[PDB]
Symmetry: C5
Subunit: 311 residues, 5 copies
């Protein structure tokens, strides 16, 4: 079979639509998500046209093998989509209405800069390669674009599923390619991060500051070193849920900065002890009293500065 | 092949039934479960009708290829089900009896609010898309819905497997869709959580309270900080067996609240020491004596309040 | 094709046999094992009968497509077995000899009560559904049932591979089903558990008891708390190699009971200190001296009681 | 079908080109990467030649089955590539233009010596086996070799994608093989390693050195031992992201060397205590004062030496 | 198609050869390795013989479907190999030369007794089942057995790839089977184990022995208990990279024995303290002084004994 013939020199328009059924498995480390959707295609083939009076029928059904079907592929998929044809229906003028249900693992990159308070735009790129007979261009049939109400992406809120109606038409290996951009806008459910990582991490930091109300070096060393180890465990736990980024993430910045607070607390604890031993407890008292205000104030201001730079 | 013709303008009723053989791999993090069952279908095709006297046979067997079979799909499956046809049998009036054995990874969401004392309703949604010739509606043949006695879901108790007999009929891409709801009611086997997480977590908390019968700051700091680290390990262990929820789980609440008890214990230990050093051990004694009663009482009441809110 | 016709009213007997080649991947958490075996089938089809004088050949070979083959399935498999036909040989009377080599992930439950000193009976269930023409019954050809000598299941000892010769004939969805039980008896290689978990766990417990020969509260607190944390790590390590059971396992019981010994050791250490501070070291000495005998004796007796209840 | 016949005794030249679409999943432990690209092939088959005047058409399209296609394979792939034919176009002289889209898991080894400041050359080897009729030789059509601008390899910077134009022609299993080398030059994004591993590891080391300004043995023992354990955690974390190499990696060397600094710090702390107890605090003071300069200076010089040897 | 006919009563000899292209993924826990190789087969079929003068051609190429091909299988593979036919060439006398490229996950057991200083012999077993027409026997064509120079197995050194030329001919299910043994001899690259596990483990042990130069019970308790916990972490890390063996491994023995050294160090530290408290520091001094020599000497001798028993 060959592609439909042109009336003039016009390209063949394949109208498209994606309707998401199931959306799942958003892997932050891999920057992939799995999709299960309907893919609808529509184009005119005059060779398939018929008289509804003479033929009796209003529409004719065909098996994929019987007629010409455009070779539509996804750009950013990992492997070729798993698809099963639902229906192929031809109207009297020759307008073909194709429907298939597919599943694919889509590879769309993520911006972790504001993690875990980030929003993403996942992409699904549809493409078509022009044949030698005639050039093929993609279009968006907006009535055949949508998502099921049940569509749930665990740990995420689905905001919108829309399509950029104008295709990106370009040359590739000396043939025209027509690319379409389907955008799924989502925003992370940050709630769990608060009682599981953020508040536990702040509690251990504040426990380290109880050393500013203690003269016992042995006890202070235990307080600041033990809590520093718990902070290392939280840093490790966090960096496992995320990929290695060439930029600083919001959580990454706070986690990093907190190390400096532990380091300065060890210095203060060491200075206090050295002074007490050197028979200068009055000077050590001044430093300890100042630290009680300095540490919380500097922590609070540094956090205002960070939140400002990131949001 | 085309769908059976209507006697009048009535839709075609496809009677369904699911009989579970093997039920396994309930992933809490992924909110998926694997199923291995029989899918039975039954509809009338008058074109297949025959006289049992003339034909000799009481029933005729056909290969899927030979006759029209409705395109039945699962909504909430991850990928398309793995199915193998067991039998296709036609009675003299034209009643077709289809049977296939399938396996699928079903995606049904879970409510972790009462975890690990939770009960779930897993769903299996059967659907059918109407063709242009005629509208197709699903039905439940209750005699062909069940489960094997051996059916075991590790760490869960299987309560019931029933079907919501009235389908959810709706329009999708300007064609009628008939959806059916098969519900598998299960309840978690919480037993293991008690000697592995709950009791170990309470033991370490009670060990931290032995600091209220000690005047040694160095020993108290060690007692409260060491046990806090073991609590962090239990929080991490628990949050690995579960997905990130936009709500508070029962275990999540208890785990979180216990951090506050550790934080207040550090404050008491710090106050006691500061007072002893300031030559006020009588005042420190009053606070320590009070804490011995306050901590267990507040812990017990706070837990009554939590159990009340969650159950 | 249709099933062979009966000489009288007798059912069709399909003789079976399983010969294990490779046995591997016993997942305790999943209660699955992988198998690679030969499945042999034999039945008589008079329609295939031939004269060896006229045909030249003594036996005729056929492709599965060419003749009727019974639809034999496994009950407790995860997905449908991967099978490849080795041979199909027909003798002049019409006796078909089918041979295939398959691989499958079998789902057979396990009893962890005596873990890691447990023995299991893995099951492989073969089944056949009767057709409308005639009822099909399974049989065991004992000469075609066995296992290779090289068959090794990592961390397990293979005791026997036998078949329950009488099939379970029952009704399912108004058709006769003939089920056969192939049993693989295995016993765990507990050896590694002793130097890796049991002895390390006992060493840390005995180290905690060196606190009964020490008057230093600060040192005792460190001894009992540090070793308790190592016990938590062993509890976590053990519960990762096992699924969540609605019963107590042998190792589970010992691990749990050892927490009580740590809890009572913390109480003794606290009492000793309180008494020494209260200027009653004589009474504290009596308690400490008693604990030196009490702790090992109670530990030894409690273990005799547990081993008795479990074995 | 047979291969094209030679005009004379010349070999058949198959012109090749790889255009990367998606590049992903670089596993450092496995030394694999996944690729999704276009494979373009071109060769002359005089048997396919036609007159454009007589035939009407300028090019003829064929199904893979209709004509002879060279059996092109990848050497260093894990399993055989997943490929789907995009187009096959024949020009009047008989020049065939083949295009397929494929995906494969490529196995190319990595040099971790300068990790995480390393650069790699990933290889994709195309090969062809000569037939008895005639020898087949590969070539590079440079206009059909490239990569998409969107091509992103997480945690890596893609420098270049080029081909070694002259094939490696050699004998294998008594037939000529023509191998081509496609090279993807990449360099690691080391940025994340600095705030997550390098700086945290240096902070804990510097904290251990605060023991040179402390006379408290109990506090020093806690400082040096606790920080050594955090260093062990970083060593374990690092060796999980990497395979077992028969050489020393850059990070491996630094991590190893830091153990020696911890060991010498324990010796100093032990010596200081022994001397103070032996009533020689003046000598212990000299050693402690010297260590304050020695440790940072030796650490800084040893690091200059290492960076020099590795870069 | 039927197998070639015998000239007399001789069996049919199928000459074999395996040439490794890529060798990868040696899983110690699973006792599996993945292979990507060429499988060459050669046998004589007189029915395929032709006169090179009359036919013009020197060799005839055939599609697998056209001629009889022996059913060759691998014994110790996990699932059936993935294979693709490269070439089939028939010489004038009827000698068939078959070539296919395959990939398989091979299950060959490992001996961890000398781990990580162990050497292994991986096996690839080729087998053939005799048909009723005639018995089939395997042979090794040594010129068609080999491996690529690039063949690299990460963390291993590939020593040799040879075949045991005499097949194992035996009866199985009343038919002859011809098994061949292909042996891949490899030896572990132990280098990484030294700076990552062995030396870190020895450093922490030697740190525990600094307690023999300290009179501070509180410091000693911290030194010996903290280092014991780091030893537990190394034991856990090691037992994760290995399966559960019914024998003692070399590393397993050293790791186990080191626990006894920690246990005796706790006893010495406890004895020293009890004696100092009992006002017997002179006796405690004798024990401590002796331990300084005893511990290193006994450690060194015990290790000589172990290395002797294992190597
Ligand atoms: C002279 C003291 C020898 C101690 C030997 C202890 C051997 C224990 C063997 C356990 C085998 C399983 C059960 C733990 C006992 C801890 C020993 C504490 C020793 C205190 C010594 C006091 C100095 C007089
Ligand atoms: C505690 C410290 C444990 C150190 C263990 C030493 C290694 C050993 O003794 O290992 C033994 C292996 C033997 O190698 P083989 O070829 O299998 O000898 C087989 C000999 N037969 C056939 C005669 C029996 O020697 C090595 O690899 C030596 C280099 C490693 C040194 C690592 C030191 C750290
Ligand atoms: Cl696609
Ligand atoms: Cl489905
Ligand atoms: Cl509606
Ligand atoms: Cl409709
Ligand atoms: Cl099966
Ligand atoms: Cl390939
Ligand atoms: Cl195989
Ligand atoms: Na088509
Ligand atoms: Na059909
Ligand atoms: Na059949
Ligand atoms: Na071809
Ligand atoms: Na064949
Ligand atoms: Na301590």
């Amino acid at each position: 079979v060959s592609p439909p013939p042109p009336i003039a020199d016009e390209p063949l328009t394949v109208n498209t639509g994606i309707y998401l059924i199931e959306c799942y498995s958003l892997d932050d480390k891999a920057e992939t998500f799995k999709v299960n959707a309907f893919l609808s295609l529509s184009w005119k083939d005059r060779r398939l046209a018929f008289d509804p009076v003479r033929s009796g029928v209003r529409v004719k059904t065909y098996e994929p093998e019987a007629i010409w079907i455009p070779e539509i592929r996804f750009v950013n998929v990992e492997n070729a989509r798993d698809a099963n044809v639902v229906d192929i229906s031809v109207s009297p003028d020759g307008t073909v209405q194709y429907l298939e249900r597919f599943s694919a693992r889509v590879l769309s990159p993520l911006d972790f800069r504001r993690y875990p308070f980030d929003s993403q735009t996942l992409h699904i790129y549809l493409i078509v390669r022009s044949v030698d007979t005639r050039n093929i261009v993609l279009a968006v049939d907006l009535e055949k674009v949508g998502k099921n109400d049940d569509v749930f992406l665990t740990g995420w809120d689905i905001e919108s599923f829309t399509a950029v109606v104008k295709p990106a038409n370009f040359a590739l290996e000396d043939r025209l390619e027509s690319k379409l951009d389907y955008q799924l806008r989502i925003s992370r459910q940050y709630f769990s991060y608060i009682p599981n990582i953020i508040l536990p991490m702040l509690f251990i930091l504040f426990i380290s500051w109880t050393a500013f109300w203690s003269t016992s070096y042995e006890a202070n060393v235990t307080l600041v070193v033990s809590t520093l180890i718990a902070h290392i465990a939280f840093n490790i736990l966090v960096e496992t849920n995320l990929p290695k980024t060439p930029y600083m993430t919001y959580t990454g910045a706070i986690i990093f900065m907190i190390y400096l607070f532990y380091f300065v607390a060890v210095i203060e604890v060491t200075v206090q002890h050295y002074l007490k031993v050197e028979s200068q407890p009055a000077r050590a008292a001044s430093i300890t009293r100042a630290s009680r205000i300095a540490f919380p104030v500097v922590f609070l201001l540094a956090n205002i500065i960070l939140a400002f730079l990131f949001f």
